[PDB]
Amino acid sequence: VYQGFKVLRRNPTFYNPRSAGMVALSYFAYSYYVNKYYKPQNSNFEEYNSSHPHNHDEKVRQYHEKTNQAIRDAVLEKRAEHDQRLREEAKL
Amino acid sequence: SYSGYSLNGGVHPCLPFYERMLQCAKSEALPIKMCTAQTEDYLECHHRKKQYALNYAIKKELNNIRIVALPRYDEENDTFVPFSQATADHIFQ
Amino acid sequence: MELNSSAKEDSHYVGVLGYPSQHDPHTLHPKKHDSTFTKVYACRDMLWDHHWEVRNTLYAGFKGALLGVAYASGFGLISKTVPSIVLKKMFRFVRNNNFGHIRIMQDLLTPYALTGFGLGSVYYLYQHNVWENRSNKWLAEVLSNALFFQVATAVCVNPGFHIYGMVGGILFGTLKYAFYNSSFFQEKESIGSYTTFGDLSEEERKKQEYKDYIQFLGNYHKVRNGQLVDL
Amino acid sequence: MSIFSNIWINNDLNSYGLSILLLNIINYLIVFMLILSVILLTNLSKFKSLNQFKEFNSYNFILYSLIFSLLSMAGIPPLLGFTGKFLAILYSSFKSQYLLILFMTILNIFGMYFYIQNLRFVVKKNKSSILNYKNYYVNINYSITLNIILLNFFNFFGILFLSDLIIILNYISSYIYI
Amino acid sequence: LNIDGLHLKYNHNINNVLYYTPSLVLFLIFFNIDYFSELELFLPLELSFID
Amino acid sequence: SQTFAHDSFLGGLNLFKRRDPRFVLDQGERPPYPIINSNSSFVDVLSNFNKADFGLVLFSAAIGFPLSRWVLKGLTFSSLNYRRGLFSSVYGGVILWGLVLGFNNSYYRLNGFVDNGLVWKRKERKLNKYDFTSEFEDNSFFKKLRIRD
Amino acid sequence: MLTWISFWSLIFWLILIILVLKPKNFISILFMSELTWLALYCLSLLFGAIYCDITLLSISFFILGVAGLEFSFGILIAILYKNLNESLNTDLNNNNNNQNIFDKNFKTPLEKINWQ
Amino acid sequence: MEFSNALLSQTKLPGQQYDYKRCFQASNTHFECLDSIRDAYDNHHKCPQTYQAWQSSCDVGIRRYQMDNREQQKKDQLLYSKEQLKNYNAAKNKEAYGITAPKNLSFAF
Amino acid sequence: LLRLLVSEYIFFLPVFTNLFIYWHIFFKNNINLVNKKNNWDKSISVKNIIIKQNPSFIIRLNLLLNSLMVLYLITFNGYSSTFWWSHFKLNNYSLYMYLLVIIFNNYFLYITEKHIKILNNYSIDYFFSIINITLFIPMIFLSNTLFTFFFLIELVSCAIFYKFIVSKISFKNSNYKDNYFSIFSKNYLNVLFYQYWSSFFSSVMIVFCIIYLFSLTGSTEWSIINFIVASNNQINYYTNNITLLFICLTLIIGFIIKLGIAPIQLYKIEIYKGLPFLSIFFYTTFYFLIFFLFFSLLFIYYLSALNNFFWIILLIISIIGIFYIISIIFDINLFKAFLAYSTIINSISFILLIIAIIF
Ligand SMILES: CCCCCCCCCCCCCCCCCC(=O)OC[C@H](COP(=O)([O-])OCC(O)COP(=O)([O-])OC[C@@H](COC(=O)CCCCCCCCCCCCCCCCC)OC(=O)CCCCCCCCCCCCCCCCC)OC(=O)CCCCCCCCCCCCCCCCC
Ligand SMILES: CCCCCCCCCCCCCCCCCC(=O)OC[C@H](COP(=O)([O-])OCC(O)COP(=O)([O-])OC[C@@H](COC(=O)CCCCCCCCCCCCCCCCC)OC(=O)CCCCCCCCCCCCCCCCC)OC(=O)CCCCCCCCCCCCCCCCC
Ligand SMILES: CCCCCCCCCCCCCCCCCC(=O)OC[C@H](COP(=O)([O-])OCC(O)COP(=O)([O-])OC[C@@H](COC(=O)CCCCCCCCCCCCCCCCC)OC(=O)CCCCCCCCCCCCCCCCC)OC(=O)CCCCCCCCCCCCCCCCC
Ligand SMILES: CCCCCCCCCCCCCCCCCC(=O)OC[C@H](COP(=O)([O-])OCC[N+](C)(C)C)OC(=O)CCCCCCCCCCCCCCCCC
Ligand SMILES: CCCCCCCCCCCCCCCCCC(=O)OC[C@H](COP(=O)([O-])OCC[N+](C)(C)C)OC(=O)CCCCCCCCCCCCCCCCC
Ligand SMILES: CCCCCCCCCCCCCCCCCC(=O)OC[C@H](COP(=O)([O-])OCC[N+](C)(C)C)OC(=O)CCCCCCCCCCCCCCCCC
Numbered sequence A: 001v002y003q004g005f006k007v008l009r010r011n012p013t014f015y016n017p018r019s020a021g022m023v024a025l026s027y028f029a030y031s032y033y034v035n036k037y038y039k040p041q042n043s044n045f046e047e048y049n050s051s052h053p054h055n056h057d058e059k060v061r062q063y064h065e066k067t068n069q070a071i072r073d074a075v076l077e078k079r080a081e082h083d084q085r086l087r088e089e090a091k092l
Numbered sequence B: 001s002y003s004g005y006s007l008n009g010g011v012h013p014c015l016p017f018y019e020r021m022l023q024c025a026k027s028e029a030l031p032i033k034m035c036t037a038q039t040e041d042y043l044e045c046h047h048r049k050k051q052y053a054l055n056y057a058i059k060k061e062l063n064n065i066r067i068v069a070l071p072r073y074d075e076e077n078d079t080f081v082p083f084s085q086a087t088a089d090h091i092f093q
Numbered sequence C: 001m002e003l004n005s006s007a008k009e010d011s012h013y014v015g016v017l018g019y020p021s022q023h024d025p026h027t028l029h030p031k032k033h034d035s036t037f038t039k040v041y042a043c044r045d046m047l048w049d050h051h052w053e054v055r056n057t058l059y060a061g062f063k064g065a066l067l068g069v070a071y072a073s074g075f076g077l078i079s080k081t082v083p084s085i086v087l088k089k090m091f092r093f094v095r096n097n098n099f100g101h102i103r104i105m106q107d108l109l110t111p112y113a114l115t116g117f118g119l120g121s122v123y124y125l126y127q128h129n130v131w132e133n134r135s136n137k138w139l140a141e142v143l144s145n146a147l148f149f150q151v152a153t154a155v156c157v158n159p160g161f162h163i164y165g166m167v168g169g170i171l172f173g174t175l176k177y178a179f180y181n182s183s184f185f186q187e188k189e190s191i192g193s194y195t196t197f198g199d200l201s202e203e204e205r206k207k208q209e210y211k212d213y214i215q216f217l218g219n220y221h222k223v224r225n226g227q228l229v230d231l
Numbered sequence D: 001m002s003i004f005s006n007i008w009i010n011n012d013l014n015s016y017g018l019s020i021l022l023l024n025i026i027n028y029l030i031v032f033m034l035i036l037s038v039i040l041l042t043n044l045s046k047f048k049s050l051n052q053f054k055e056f057n058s059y060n061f062i063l064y065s066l067i068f069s070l071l072s073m074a075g076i077p078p079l080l081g082f083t084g085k086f087l088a089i090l091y092s093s094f095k096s097q098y099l100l101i102l103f104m105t106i107l108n109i110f111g112m113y114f115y116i117q118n119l120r121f122v123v124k125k126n127k128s129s130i131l132n133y134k135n136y137y138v139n140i141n142y143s144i145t146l147n148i149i150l151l152n153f154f155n156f157f158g159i160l161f162l163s164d165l166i167i168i169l170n171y172i173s174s175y176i177y178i
Numbered sequence E: 001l002n003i004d005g006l007h008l009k010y011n012h013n014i015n016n017v018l019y020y021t022p023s024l025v026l027f028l029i030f031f032n033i034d035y036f037s038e039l040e041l042f043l044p045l046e047l048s049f050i051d
Numbered sequence F: 001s002q003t004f005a006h007d008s009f010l011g012g013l014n015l016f017k018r019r020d021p022r023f024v025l026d027q028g029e030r031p032p033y034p035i036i037n038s039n040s041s042f043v044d045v046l047s048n049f050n051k052a053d054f055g056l057v058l059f060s061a062a063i064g065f066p067l068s069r070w071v072l073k074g075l076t077f078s079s080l081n082y083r084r085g086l087f088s089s090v091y092g093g094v095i096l097w098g099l100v101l102g103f104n105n106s107y108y109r110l111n112g113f114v115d116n117g118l119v120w121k122r123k124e125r126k127l128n129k130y131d132f133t134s135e136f137e138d139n140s141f142f143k144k145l146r147i148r149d
Numbered sequence G: 001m002l003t004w005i006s007f008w009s010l011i012f013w014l015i016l017i018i019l020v021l022k023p024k025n026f027i028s029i030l031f032m033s034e035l036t037w038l039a040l041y042c043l044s045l046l047f048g049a050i051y052c053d054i055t056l057l058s059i060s061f062f063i064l065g066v067a068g069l070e071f072s073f074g075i076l077i078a079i080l081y082k083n084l085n086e087s088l089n090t091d092l093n094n095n096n097n098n099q100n101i102f103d104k105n106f107k108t109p110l111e112k113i114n115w116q
Numbered sequence H: 001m002e003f004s005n006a007l008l009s010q011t012k013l014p015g016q017q018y019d020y021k022r023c024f025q026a027s028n029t030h031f032e033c034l035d036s037i038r039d040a041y042d043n044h045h046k047c048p049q050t051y052q053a054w055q056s057s058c059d060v061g062i063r064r065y066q067m068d069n070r071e072q073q074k075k076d077q078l079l080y081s082k083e084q085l086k087n088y089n090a091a092k093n094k095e096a097y098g099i100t101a102p103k104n105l106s107f108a109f
Numbered sequence I: 001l002l003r004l005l006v007s008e009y010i011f012f013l014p015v016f017t018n019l020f021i022y023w024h025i026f027f028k029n030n031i032n033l034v035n036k037k038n039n040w041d042k043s044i045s046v047k048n049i050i051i052k053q054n055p056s057f058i059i060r061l062n063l064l065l066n067s068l069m070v071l072y073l074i075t076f077n078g079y080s081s082t083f084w085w086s087h088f089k090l091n092n093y094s095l096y097m098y099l100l101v102i103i104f105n106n107y108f109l110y111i112t113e114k115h116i117k118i119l120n121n122y123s124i125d126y127f128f129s130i131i132n133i134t135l136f137i138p139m140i141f142l143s144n145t146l147f148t149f150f151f152l153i154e155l156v157s158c159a160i161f162y163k164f165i166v167s168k169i170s171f172k173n174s175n176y177k178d179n180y181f182s183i184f185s186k187n188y189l190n191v192l193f194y195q196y197w198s199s200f201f202s203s204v205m206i207v208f209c210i211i212y213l214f215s216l217t218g219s220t221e222w223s224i225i226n227f228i229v230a231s232n233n234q235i236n237y238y239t240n241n242i243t244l245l246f247i248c249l250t251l252i253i254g255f256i257i258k259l260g261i262a263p264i265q266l267y268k269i270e271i272y273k274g275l276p277f278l279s280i281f282f283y284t285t286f287y288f289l290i291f292f293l294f295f296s297l298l299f300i301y302y303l304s305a306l307n308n309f310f311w312i313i314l315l316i317i318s319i320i321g322i323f324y325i326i327s328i329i330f331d332i333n334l335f336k337a338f339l340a341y342s343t344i345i346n347s348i349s350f351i352l353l354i355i356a357i358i359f
């Protein structure tokens, strides 16, 4: 920096070092809080696909999954039977 | 809208799932309940929630003490050799 | 989004459907062979036990305190004007002390937090010990909220606004009966749904449904009055 | 929605609340147009305060047109705004919203007095002169008076012909598959 | 406009302590839209292979 | 018999004759007339121009004179040159609108929306279950404005 | 420390909070509005990269154009302040007492209230 | 609108287009064969070639709309007739001029 | 791309024709005063350089082209589907909304023409802005995606800002006392300031909502959004209630700031105070018939799958607004304030009706 000293005399490091440190500490604390506690809670991956889920949300999700699977299986079977019956009736 | 393009002018990776979902929705008389499989596949290809859950589980397992040494990969023969066996390409040798 | 989902649950319907029930115990049973640390850590289920009156009172107090702090953050403090000398002194404290903002926030939010905690605890105890087993739920909610908010407005705000407190309490009780004790936008059952019990053949069920349809026809005014043209 | 041996019966028309909302919007626009036409017929600079409602104290046509427009905005039964308000309350009852009905009524009565209080200011000691002068004489616009007269007729007798408007609005909304 | 650079004599401390610090605290406590995105270093880079 | 011949100068009056008050048909509903070209481009639509479209343009030209003068009657503080220029602009706009209407008519004839001179081999006939207008139209002037199978 | 998604989602509303917080000087509010538009620009680009969405990527130039037009309007209004005789510091355009201002003091344009 | 078959069929891929001439020709052929069969329930397997042509030419949404319209038409044909509907509508329009007074002191219900 | 079907852009021809005609005539009028007199030309009368053209001809031109658009709609035919890359929807309900907006605009323009003949306090630029608004505002109901809706509303907002900019400021009244004294009126700046900042807030919030809707669902089309939300409810795959609630809140708050509903109403009062009566006459029509109607259709038709979140937000907003205005509506003392608060009260009532409908 040409005339680096004259340029950096007034503000070598910070204008309000205390406030800069408070900003850094708040940012660090908030990142810690979010990542460690808040986002994992919302994601709810601790008991994901657990065979014995103790969480109501996970139990509801597994219920939705099994119910959708049962619906798809039943409808596929019924449609196959219906198509077979129609094909049999066609050749008469 | 769903343009269906990639970031280099190609095809969006979700396009097959999106086409399947739209086809099912048009065909079915009860699209909401009868297109669950296609819609879930599209949402998975879009959000990747299941892969993130798998990664979370794998991170927990790695944190737990169960794995010591993975087998080395012999690239010349495209095989896997146990870490115990010594090879010329082995780091420790 | 639902309000008071657990209370307004159809146990029979969820049981017949297989849907998971919110009334499940939700408790931990550590083994006798488990570690001492595990046994101690398994005691946290008392924080989930909903029959613990002390736990529920502290829960209601925390809710009230949070509401009071939110009100102070939003409207109360900004509306209230602090003396210039007091503001200068507290700013000087901030300058002369690290984290002075935290202590200033504590001082400013102490009144609102404490009054909110008191209101929440008193309201929970009031509603639970009294009005919990009344017959007319709407009337119970209206009267209880009217009286409670009348007293609250007389004490916290001003004794001269107790009539407005009572009217607001009546309105709040009606609103709570509508959307808290009742499920208007929180339906978990299809309208007209039912369950079948007994060994009735499908033919018998269809015959009964045909009779029900014949009865239902009488609902139409034209057929009942015989005022239909011959098609 | 009723089921009788797998036969669904629907005695409810889903595309009816939207028609009622359109009807309310149209009725408010019509009444707003009536009042604004009355204002535009006159000199605009006179009306700058609620007290200046007395300036409407002009010949019978303008005076009573303003009065009936204010009453219609308030929601007095015979007039047009009543039809919209009554149908909104009817649909709320049909949907079984007693709390919504309560809040609608509170707002309706408060707004009713808000509109009505200006009738007190409409009283004037003498007759106002709010017309622009052109060729040394007050300029009265026959076209705007005719439009105000049609609006007045419909404001007075909207109830009689409301069935046709309701049919048309329901016809428009039925295309929406909701 | 405002060539000299002189600005209004404004004290931000009053509003900071009355409305903004607590409101920001509440918003930060209750605001997170990121659902399941994972930081780098969450898992070893050697597990990722698609790139 | 109910619609003017599509190849005449009055074949553009079939735009006001509609079977139902709907704007557009459903996705899957057959057009009233056989489809000549579903995927019609600009050049082929222009090539499909007809005496009906020319008649629509002529109607626009004839009706744009009274309308242009009506618009001009609200003009003040204008020189003769500007008044004539404004009349020319408005008249050209009306004629351009006529051209647009002719283009739309040609597009409709290609798609079968309006009478294109062809008829489906087997008509899909409705059941007039709800009928509030048959007698009214038969006894009134509006029977001309509606097309019935 | 924070994932980019959460960081940008948070800083957008933080920028809005700063815009509201700073003393209402039209020029300062205009700069803050420009910064808000650029935060949206960055967030849209991030989501477009994540989801392979050319529409999200292309939102960048649309945001730039809207921001440019709004900035032009803001410049014009700030200049119009002079002809309308309004201080850029809006808080000085009313007589309401404000403890946030050290030297806010207005008097009626008179010299003596009492003559006799 | 998530439950609306019409609105869902109005959706399409960015580059998708419909050849209405070909689709309607195929559908007309298939429906003529079905009408010749003249069964209570449409058994498409009785018309294999035309069914395959119809499937290839027409889109899923168009086919869904066509089948629903065919079902409605079958129900209407089973229920009513042209002359019956004409007479009924004429009688109803004639009645509309009169009033519908209440029937006091009824006997039913 | 090999073939460009006429179905993708058939509907754009009438609007482009109207746009061309309007702007060509606008430029001609702008350069109207230029008429060179050649040295050989003879003037029957001395030219009157001072001119103040009445905009009656502009209003009549707007009426004529609106009538032509009505004729196009009446003669319109086609299939019900989307055109131009699924960015615009073409169906019976959308077309009827377009036609209704056009008809109401035509009637209001007719009344305005009569008023202008009565007295002229409005320039040609005022009615050119009205022409742009009338031409571009009915296209909103043809929107098939939130993206195109945002751009159309942004264009209409620019047109309305143009209309507010071209408001007449100084009048030739009978007050002869202020010839040599400075009188300060802030109504013009207040209108511009509040309109500009409300537009900014609404635009940023709507863009944020659009970005997050794209993140949630690969597209921003109404049908795809509703289908994906319903399927998500069925599957229970994506269950970030915080994100869904925040998207709904951002959208609702953006529209609240845009319209000026009871929670945010004072800026609307200021705008009405500063606007002329004719500006209010047109703005109330545009607002109620388009902005509020589309706001209602967001919960009724477009974003219907999210009503499980919208209901509580709407209820809270309605309750807060009612209890906030119950006292304010009796504190005003101005005609413009009365008109604005009439609009606000009707808006709250219609919001309650919308809650009842979405129930
Ligand atoms: C991520 C975004 C934010 C990043 C940081 C900021 C940078 C971006 C700025 C732009 C954004 C908008 C900013 C608006 C500012 C408004 C005005 C203002 O306040 O600043 C003016 C203020 C004065 O300006 P100045 O005049 O130039 O400076 C004069 C002095 O020199 C100044 O020195 P000072 O010492 O006087 O000031 C210090 C200042 C900054 O604060 C600090 O000093 C650092 C505080 C760090 C957090 C400490 C709390 C514990 C954290 C734990 C984290 C891990 C949790 C894990 C949980 C696991 C669970 C399993 O103090 C405060 O702000 C007061 C509040 C701080 C405590 C917050 C407590 C939150 C939780 C409360 C829960 C309920 C408790 C109930 C009672 C319980 C009893 C047991 O400016 C500054 O000091 C610098 C900016 C600081 C902004 C802080 C904003 C509040 C957010 C704090 C962190 C919240 C964490 C939440 C998650 C964790 C919860 C546990
Ligand atoms: C030159 C015109 C000659 C007209 C001759 C009569 C022909 C019919 C009227 C045709 C007018 C067309 C052009 C519009 C002119 C009016 C607007 C205007 O701007 O005029 C400026 C024009 C010149 O300006 P201006 O005079 O300086 O301005 C003064 C203001 O206009 C203020 O003047 P105002 O205070 O006297 O205004 C009347 C006032 C108060 O006016 C009234 O109250 C009207 C009372 C009518 C007498 C019968 C009432 C019976 C009610 C029984 C209960 C029914 C319940 C039904 C259930 C639903 C609820 C109704 O305001 C209202 O009308 C609002 C209340 C409306 C209540 C709704 C009653 C509906 C009854 C429907 C008819 C029932 C017939 C049953 C028998 C037949 C069965 C087959 O005004 C006039 O020259 C005087 C107009 C006065 C009203 C004329 C109509 C009253 C007589 C109606 C007899 C026929 C029955 C009604 C049905 C008519 C066909 C739909
Ligand atoms: C129950 C609640 C009901 C609420 C209703 C709310 C609205 C009520 C008030 C307004 C109603 C409309 C009034 C007529 C238009 C205004 C101008 C006018 O005609 O007077 C000037 C003109 C005065 O002539 P003048 O004094 O000798 O010379 C005037 C100037 O010196 C020289 O004049 P100029 O050369 O400057 O201008 C000449 C031109 C001036 O007139 C104009 O330019 C017309 C201006 C209005 C344009 C918009 C009309 C929309 C009509 C459709 C329904 C919606 C109405 C919405 C109205 C409010 C919108 C904000 O005159 C005309 O050509 C008049 C023709 C009027 C009929 C136009 C019909 C258009 C239909 C388009 C849609 C068709 C269906 C499409 C379906 C598509 C399906 C896919 O009028 C007359 O010559 C006759 C006046 C006396 C008879 C008036 C009869 C009015 C009948 C209204 C029926 C309303 C619908 C049926 C009832 C619905 C509820 C049950
Ligand atoms: C590329 C260009 C190179 C050439 C540039 C020119 C070089 C020569 C001039 C440089 C200094 C500028 C002139 C200063 C003149 C005034 C002297 C003075 O008062 O003291 C200066 C400064 C005084 O700072 P201050 O505290 O007064 O700053 C506040 C300033 N006011 C008062 C205006 C608000 O001295 C120091 O701060 C020394 C102690 C802190 C040093 C910084 C520590 C943190 C950053 C480095 C971390 C390094 C790693 C360790 C951390 C952990 C790592 C894991
Ligand atoms: C929009 C609708 C508005 C509705 C307005 C509602 C009115 C609100 C009035 C609030 C009054 C103040 C709170 C009263 C709290 C006590 C209520 C109670 O005990 O009833 C519960 C018990 C619980 O009843 P229950 O629920 O077991 O049985 C209900 C019975 N049926 C179904 C028939 C309705 O109810 C009653 O016995 C009284 C019911 C009627 C309300 C009577 C209020 C009396 C208030 C004055 C008391 C005076 C005491 C002595 C002092 C006299 C003066 C010196
Ligand atoms: C925050 C909690 C409270 C929320 C309350 C929400 C519900 C409010 C219900 C209000 C009902 C009345 C609707 C009309 C409101 C009119 C507002 C207005 O501006 O009016 C001013 C006028 C009075 O003002 P004024 O006309 O004298 O003003 C003169 C001008 N100034 C003031 C400048 C000098 O109010 C009225 O005219 C009366 C209104 C109708 C009253 C109807 C009867 C009473 C209804 C309530 C029940 C009371 C039961 C008491 C039983 C006692 C038994 C012993």
Ligand SMILES: CCCCCCCCCCCCCCCCCC(=O)OC[C@H](COP(=O)([O-])OCC[N+](C)(C)C)OC(=O)CCCCCCCCCCCCCCCCC
Pocket: F041, F042, F043, F044, I002, I003, I004, I009, I012, I015, I024, I136, I139, I152, I155
């Ligand atoms: C809210 C805002 C308003 C509404 C929304 C705005 C919509 C914006 C999007 C509109 C898209 C429109 C795209 C149309 C593209 C097709 C055009 C077309 O029909 O071409 C057919 C023809 C081709 O027809 P074709 O497609 O049949 O040809 C191919 C035929 N085959 C395949 C068989 C070989 O196009 C052309 O040949 C010309 C192409 C354009 C050439 C460049 C024109 C530039 C014009 C600049 C402006 C000039 C102004 C002059 C003013 C004079 C008076 C002052």
Ligand SMILES: CCCCCCCCCCCCCCCCCC(=O)OC[C@H](COP(=O)([O-])OCC[N+](C)(C)C)OC(=O)CCCCCCCCCCCCCCCCC
Pocket: F010, F013, F016, F063, F066, F067, F070, F073, I063, I064, I067, I068, I071
């Ligand atoms: C069996 C054989 C049948 C053969 C039929 C052949 C003829 C077919 C065409 C018939 C046309 C009938 C008249 C159409 C309307 C004429 C309007 C006119 O000239 O008014 C000028 C007038 C001009 O005014 P003016 O000329 O009346 O006088 C004005 C005088 N001052 C100003 C003093 C009051 O136009 C208007 O005022 C309209 C202004 C608004 C714009 C309205 C546009 C309407 C466009 C209509 C297009 C044609 C629709 C045809 C529908 C046919 C349905 C079957």
Ligand SMILES: CCCCCCCCCCCCCCCCCC(=O)OC[C@H](COP(=O)(O)OCCN)OC(=O)CCCCCCCCCCCCCCCCC
Pocket: A011, A012, A013, A014, A015, A016
């Ligand atoms: C080329 C293609 C086209 C693109 C062209 C791009 C052009 C970029 C133009 C950049 C202009 C730079 C000069 C002007 C800004 C200088 C910084 C400044 O003004 O700071 C303001 C603000 C902090 O201000 P304050 O808190 O008062 O303290 C000042 C301490 N510098 O500043 C801040 O907010 C943060 C400042 C951070 C300063 C960091 C200094 C680091 C010094 C490193 C020394 C060498 C060692 C590096 C080690 C790296 C290890 C990884």
